[PDB]
Amino acid sequence: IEGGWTGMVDGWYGYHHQNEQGSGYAADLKSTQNAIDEITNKVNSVIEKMNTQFTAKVDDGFLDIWTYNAELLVLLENERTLDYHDSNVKNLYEKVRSQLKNNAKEIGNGCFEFYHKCDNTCMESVKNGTYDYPKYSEEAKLNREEID
Amino acid sequence: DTLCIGYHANNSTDTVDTVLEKNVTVTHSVNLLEDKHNGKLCKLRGVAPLHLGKCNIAGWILGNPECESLSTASSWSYIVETSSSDNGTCYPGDFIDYEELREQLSSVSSFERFEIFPKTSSWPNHDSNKGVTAACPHAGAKSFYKNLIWLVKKGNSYPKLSKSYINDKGKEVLVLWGIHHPSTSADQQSLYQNADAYVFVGSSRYSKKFKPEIAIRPKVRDQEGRMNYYWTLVEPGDKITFEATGNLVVPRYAFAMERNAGSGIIISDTPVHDCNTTCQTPKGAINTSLPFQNIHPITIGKCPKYVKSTKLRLATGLRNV
Ligand SMILES: *[C@@H]1O[C@H](CO)[C@@H](O[C@@H]2O[C@H](CO)[C@@H](O)[C@H](O)[C@H]2NC(C)=O)[C@H](O)[C@H]1NC(C)=O
Numbered sequence: 458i459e460g461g462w463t464g465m466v467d468g469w470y471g472y473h474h475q476n477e478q479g480s481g482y483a484a485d486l487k488s489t490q491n492a493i494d495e496i497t498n499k500v501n502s503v504i505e506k507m508n509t510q511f512t513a514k515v516d517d518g519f520l521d522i523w524t525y526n527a528e529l530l531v532l533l534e535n536e537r538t539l540d541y542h543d544s545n546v547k548n549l550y551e552k553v554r555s556q557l558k559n560n561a562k563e564i565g566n567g568c569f570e571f572y573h574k575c576d577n578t579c580m581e582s583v584k585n586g587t588y589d590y591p592k593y594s595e596e597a598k599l600n601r602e603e604i605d
Numbered sequence: 606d607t608l609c610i611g612y613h614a615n616n617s618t619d620t621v622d623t624v625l626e627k628n629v630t631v632t633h634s635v636n637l638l639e640d641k642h643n644g645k646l647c648k649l650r651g652v653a654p655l656h657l658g659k660c661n662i663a664g665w666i667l668g669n670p671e672c673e674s675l676s677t678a679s680s681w682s683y684i685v686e687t688s689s690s691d692n693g694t695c696y697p698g699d700f701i702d703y704e705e706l707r708e709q710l711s712s713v714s715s716f717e718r719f720e721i722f723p724k725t726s727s728w729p730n731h732d733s734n735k736g737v738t739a740a741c742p743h744a745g746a747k748s749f750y751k752n753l754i755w756l757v758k759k760g761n762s763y764p765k766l767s768k769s770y771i772n773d774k775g776k777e778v779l780v781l782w783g784i785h786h787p788s789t790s791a792d793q794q795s796l797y798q799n800a801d802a803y804v805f806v807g808s809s810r811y812s813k814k815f816k817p818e819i820a821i822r823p824k825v826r827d828q829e830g831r832m833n834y835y836w837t838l839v840e841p842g843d844k845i846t847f848e849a850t851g852n853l854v855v856p857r858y859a860f861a862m863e864r865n866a867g868s869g870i871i872i873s874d875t876p877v878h879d880c881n882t883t884c885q886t887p888k889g890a891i892n893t894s895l896p897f898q899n900i901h902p903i904t905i906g907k908c909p910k911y912v913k914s915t916k917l918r919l920a921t922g923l924r925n926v
């Protein structure tokens with residue numbers, strides 16, 4: 458997806474939908490939850506690990522390397538993060554993309570254009586991980602084929 | 606009838622670093638350093654440091670006359686001397702075990718200056734009034750350290766000299782004396798009359814004998830002679846003795862004291878305040894639960910580990926556009 462959302466509120470990532478009802482933003486729960494559960498967990502374990510020895514150049518030589526050793530620990534977990542969430546954005550996208558399949562158009566940009574009419578509890582249904590391809594199959598196939 | 610997917614672009618501007626891209630801006634981060642300080646030197650937990658403006662520790666403790674006014678106390682959290690504090694040993698010479706002394710005195714709970722050998726009472730057979738130099742001017746006239754007396758032949762005889770002090774105070778007693786090495790044999794003879802002159806000093810913790818070295822050193826503050834400055838801590842119970850046939854610069858004032866686990870000596874032109882803190886730095890103080898800092902190698906009390914890195918910025922969250 459080619460951009461972020463200034464209007465996002467409750468969290469790091471989620472969906473923005475305009476249906477025959479209305480429009481606007483929202484975000485997920487567990488995906489944002491277990492995100493930080495893993496992140497702050499990582500943020501700790503890194504710095505915690507540095508310490509010193511007792512594994513059973515005054516400080517001038519030691520220090521310069523301690524730093525050099527430490528500085529990179531960040532340049533990692535940093536790098537390992539911007540990839541982490543990115544992975545979680547992909548994962549968000551695809552979990553819907555497999556769910557809907559033929560039912561909605563992938564215009565990309567995280568965006569789907571529903572062939573059928575989706576309104577809430579169908580929406581949240583998708584979100585809950587429970588969405589009926591059969592329920593909406595025809596409602597889709599008809600509208601989709603007029604296009605082609 | 607769409608449903609889309611996107612993410613947060615934060616009002617927050619702080620940028621961090623990655624392998625493939627350095628400058629990169631993010632929504633969220635954390636900084637493990639502390640750049641920032643109150644730009645002041647404070648009372649450390651309610652106790653003020655000691656500040657010697659134009660004096661360094663030596664001139665102060667010796668009682669250099671340029672240190673006459675200065676300040677006092679029974680107590681100080683730490684010690685601060687400025688970049689500008691030049692008033693040292695005005696008679697040229699080496700201060701001995703200086704660094705060690707500096708450390709003993711960083712933090713003090715009780716500090717009591719007493720005159721361990723009264724100038725009037727103590728030295729009946731030697732001359733206690735000649736002891737001035739132009740090397741140590743005060744008020745436009747020849748002078749000397751306040752805490753020592755430069756003793757000189759009364760007569761044309763400089764008899765043998767022994768004085769003893771028992772420490773009846775409650776604490777450690779810091780005692781300082783010095784040894785005069787004059788420039789020429791003639792010089793030696795005028796002062797002490799005795800070419801053979803030696804000096805001895807002793808205690809439970811201390812024993813040393815001294816021979817002066819006559820020789821012509823380069824002129825400093827007009828002195829071609831030298832003066833070495835020595836010291837010791839006499840234990841509460843302990844006794845200390847002094848012998849000389851010459852060349853000894855006798856104690857007058859000494860200090861009863863009880864230490865604290867050492868703070869440091871901060872060297873800064875930073876001003877003191879009535880403020881307070883846990884963690885003091887040459888540049889300022891720091892209130893942080895923070896792990897580190899790039900601020901100064903030298904910290905006092907409970908302080909964040911020093912680090913030479915520019916910036917440490919992790920990532921709580923994603924990039925933004
Ligand atoms: C106290 O410190 C001041 C400056 O640190 C000394 O004054 C300087 O003395 C030297 C040589 O005596 C000269 O190079 C400077 O021109 C002097 N400047 C001033 C401000 O007088 C002063 O002599 C010191 N006093 C003692 C006894 O140490």
Ligand SMILES: *[C@@H]1O[C@H](CO)[C@@H](O)[C@H](O)[C@H]1NC(C)=O
Pocket residue numbers: 649650651881882883
């Ligand atoms: C700073 O000052 C108070 C009251 O003057 C003092 O008692 C306290 O120990 C200090 N604060 C600290 C150590 O946080």
Ligand SMILES: *[C@@H]1O[C@H](CO)[C@@H](O)[C@H](O)[C@H]1NC(C)=O
Pocket residue numbers: 892893
């Ligand atoms: C800074 O330290 C003082 C000590 O009394 C405290 O009152 C204040 O809340 C502290 N601020 C921070 C950022 O912790």
